[PDB]
Scaffold this active site. Structure first.
Site, PDB file in Angstrom:
ATOM      1  N   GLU A   1      32.631  17.973  57.621  1.00  0.00           N
ATOM      2  CA  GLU A   1      33.184  18.150  56.278  1.00  0.00           C
ATOM      3  C   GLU A   1      32.187  18.757  55.288  1.00  0.00           C
ATOM      4  O   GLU A   1      32.527  19.676  54.550  1.00  0.00           O
ATOM      5  CB  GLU A   1      33.692  16.822  55.730  1.00  0.00           C
ATOM      6  CG  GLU A   1      34.906  16.270  56.453  1.00  0.00           C
ATOM      7  CD  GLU A   1      36.165  17.104  56.303  1.00  0.00           C
ATOM      8  OE1 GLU A   1      36.170  18.116  55.578  1.00  0.00           O
ATOM      9  OE2 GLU A   1      37.172  16.734  56.941  1.00  0.00           O
TER      10      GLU A   1
ATOM     11  N   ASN B   1      40.971  24.405  47.727  1.00  0.00           N
ATOM     12  CA  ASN B   1      42.118  24.596  48.626  1.00  0.00           C
ATOM     13  C   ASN B   1      43.093  25.631  48.080  1.00  0.00           C
ATOM     14  O   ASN B   1      43.132  25.887  46.870  1.00  0.00           O
ATOM     15  CB  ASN B   1      42.839  23.270  48.868  1.00  0.00           C
ATOM     16  CG  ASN B   1      41.924  22.210  49.463  1.00  0.00           C
ATOM     17  OD1 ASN B   1      41.837  21.089  48.959  1.00  0.00           O
ATOM     18  ND2 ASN B   1      41.235  22.566  50.539  1.00  0.00           N
TER      19      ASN B   1
ATOM     20  N   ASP C   1      46.206  25.492  47.564  1.00  0.00           N
ATOM     21  CA  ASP C   1      47.163  24.889  46.630  1.00  0.00           C
ATOM     22  C   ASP C   1      46.576  24.577  45.252  1.00  0.00           C
ATOM     23  O   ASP C   1      47.283  24.100  44.365  1.00  0.00           O
ATOM     24  CB  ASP C   1      47.824  23.640  47.251  1.00  0.00           C
ATOM     25  CG  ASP C   1      46.888  22.433  47.335  1.00  0.00           C
ATOM     26  OD1 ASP C   1      45.662  22.577  47.150  1.00  0.00           O
ATOM     27  OD2 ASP C   1      47.389  21.315  47.576  1.00  0.00           O
TER      28      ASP C   1
ATOM     29  N   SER D   1      44.065  22.374  44.687  1.00  0.00           N
ATOM     30  CA  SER D   1      43.292  21.132  44.773  1.00  0.00           C
ATOM     31  C   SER D   1      41.887  21.472  45.265  1.00  0.00           C
ATOM     32  O   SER D   1      41.627  22.587  45.728  1.00  0.00           O
ATOM     33  CB  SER D   1      43.960  20.106  45.694  1.00  0.00           C
ATOM     34  OG  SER D   1      43.970  20.586  47.021  1.00  0.00           O
TER      35      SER D   1
ATOM     36  N   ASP E   1      38.337  19.696  47.314  1.00  0.00           N
ATOM     37  CA  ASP E   1      37.724  18.639  48.129  1.00  0.00           C
ATOM     38  C   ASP E   1      36.301  18.380  47.651  1.00  0.00           C
ATOM     39  O   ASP E   1      35.562  19.321  47.359  1.00  0.00           O
ATOM     40  CB  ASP E   1      37.670  19.032  49.601  1.00  0.00           C
ATOM     41  CG  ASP E   1      39.016  19.409  50.158  1.00  0.00           C
ATOM     42  OD1 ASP E   1      40.025  18.791  49.769  1.00  0.00           O
ATOM     43  OD2 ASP E   1      39.050  20.335  51.000  1.00  0.00           O
TER      44      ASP E   1
ATOM     45  N   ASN F   1      40.122  14.888  48.716  1.00  0.00           N
ATOM     46  CA  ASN F   1      40.951  15.852  48.002  1.00  0.00           C
ATOM     47  C   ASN F   1      41.558  15.356  46.686  1.00  0.00           C
ATOM     48  O   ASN F   1      42.045  14.232  46.600  1.00  0.00           O
ATOM     49  CB  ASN F   1      42.067  16.316  48.943  1.00  0.00           C
ATOM     50  CG  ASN F   1      42.854  17.474  48.391  1.00  0.00           C
ATOM     51  OD1 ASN F   1      43.947  17.290  47.883  1.00  0.00           O
ATOM     52  ND2 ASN F   1      42.303  18.678  48.485  1.00  0.00           N
TER      53      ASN F   1
END
Length: 129
Positions: free
Chosen positions: A35, A46, A48, A50, A52, A59
């Site tokens: 990660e 992301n 969309d 969002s 992380d 998220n």
């Protein structure tokens, strides 16, 4: 902060992740490796909108507030910035909630794709724990 492998394993154990929801410490270390490469300051945007955050790339769609993810929730009740701290408390506490959500560690796509079903104990091999 960029953790060493064993340093993070120890910190995660200290914060109660070892065998949390049945996931051995190696699973958590492996997930963090892929990660964030063990970097608490890791962020990723992301498609969309969002974002992380942190060692486990948690998220903003569900788990933290960043003020810029329309329609999102803040189920861990924290600013997403808390997930970037050198202190992993907020990331660990939020991860406990996520892994309890129903799909276990499959919530982390990188865990499913890169850690799941592998020799994850290798990630804590040699470490003083």
């Amino acid at each position: 902060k960029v953790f060493g492998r064993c340093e993070l394993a120890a910190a995660m154990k200290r914060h109660g992740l070892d065998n949390y929801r049945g996931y051995s410490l190696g699973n958590w270390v492996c997930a963090a490796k892929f990660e964030s490469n063990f970097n608490t300051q890791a962020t990723n945007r992301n498609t969309d909108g969002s974002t992380d955050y942190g060692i486990l790339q948690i998220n903003s769609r569900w788990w933290c507030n960043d003020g810029r993810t329309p329609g999102s929730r803040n189920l861990c009740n924290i600013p997403c910035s808390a997930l970037l701290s050198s202190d992993i408390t907020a990331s660990v506490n939020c991860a406990k909630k996520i892994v309890s959500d129903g799909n276990g560690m499959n919530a982390w796509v990188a865990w499913r794709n890169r850690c799941k079903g592998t020799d994850v104990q290798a990630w804590i091999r040699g470490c003083r724990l």
